[PDB]
Symmetry: D2
Subunit: 118 residues, 4 copies
């Protein structure tokens, strides 16, 4: 079986990610819906690695937040978990905007996000 | 000044070319370490002169994926892209997921 | 409640034992994945009931070093250590430094 | 030649790190001096890996900031650089204190620090 990025995904926080069809070049776009009732959507786009047509490919995407000057990038692998469900194991970097090059040092946060099909 | 469009290099001599950034902030380019495509977006919320951006390099010579995020600055008057990245390796079993992600920095200057 | 002292485990079944935390916030312990020592400190500035802490595991079966940092929380009423870590591998040449560091998370619960 | 952690080190920002003697078990303590004129010192302690008595060992330490509720951990390798100087290539995680487990996700920052002998 293969894990496929296309579809709707959710995480522990109830965020909602929708990824479109992956084209011939491994490119895809989608939307990332998060709460802050108050919910907001931001576009995302990235690629799935296609090198040896693995059934569990690595991928990455950038979320261009519409409600902040920040940017978050996610990278991970689309796995068929031991329990048979597809799962996206990802890690992310959240970059904040700073005005002075001197404050660059503390502008990057890191964390994880695990998604399963909605 | 500090436009992503153009050619960039780093201490290792890699070559990153970024094309025009469209009205939505989207851009594509290539990364030569031998050449792989990259796609990303620059944030445009407050039309900043030094916005944050992120991109994904879809390596064509391995099953891995690397993502970069950072901001452009003017140090002299020299432009610099200060970025941090996550390199995701492909593992065969989900049990090895925990050691599949490397992290680091990459500072680019105009070639 | 939420004292670091005690025995902790995780989803992988590792076993982390932490001893008493001294007046300066210092502590030692062991990490069984097979047993390696760890040393760290918990911040005590505002005598928080859920202070931040960090520690270093000095692996005895490899040339690597892993550092952890996080905070204890009460989810039910169950205590949990939410930590993030950096695993540093030993490389022979400084040229390979850029790919020597892995990053991840580890959530611990009382054993 | 061997790279040795003991001594005084500085980075690009002029921060100042002093590391004491490394004992038989690879343990060491020291102080980390940073600016915010206005300078402050915080204690640090960690270990150097001794497994195959490498000339360029890995190590890690925790800085217990005295002026914040935060904690930073550093890990890296003590190298003899190509130019012959000893250099500490490190990466760090800076953990901020949050009150709600719900805000744990954005409490960790990541970055690098390169030190050379003062």
């Amino acid at each position: 079986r293969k894990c496929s990025l296309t579809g709707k995904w959710t995480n522990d926080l109830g965020s909602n990610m929708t990824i479109g069809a992956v084209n011939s070049r491994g490119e895809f776009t989608g939307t990332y819906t998060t709460a802050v009732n108050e919910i907001k959507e931001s576009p995302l786009h990235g690629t799935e690695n296609t090198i040896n047509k693995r059934t569990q490919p690595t991928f990455g995407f950038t979320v261009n937040w519409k409600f902040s000057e920040s940017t978050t990038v996610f990278t991970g692998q689309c796995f068929i978990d031991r329990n048979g469900k597809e799962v996206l194991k990802t890690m992310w970097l959240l970059r904040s905007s700073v005005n002075d090059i001197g404050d660059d040092k503390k502008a990057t946060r890191v964390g994880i996000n695990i998604f399963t099909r909605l």
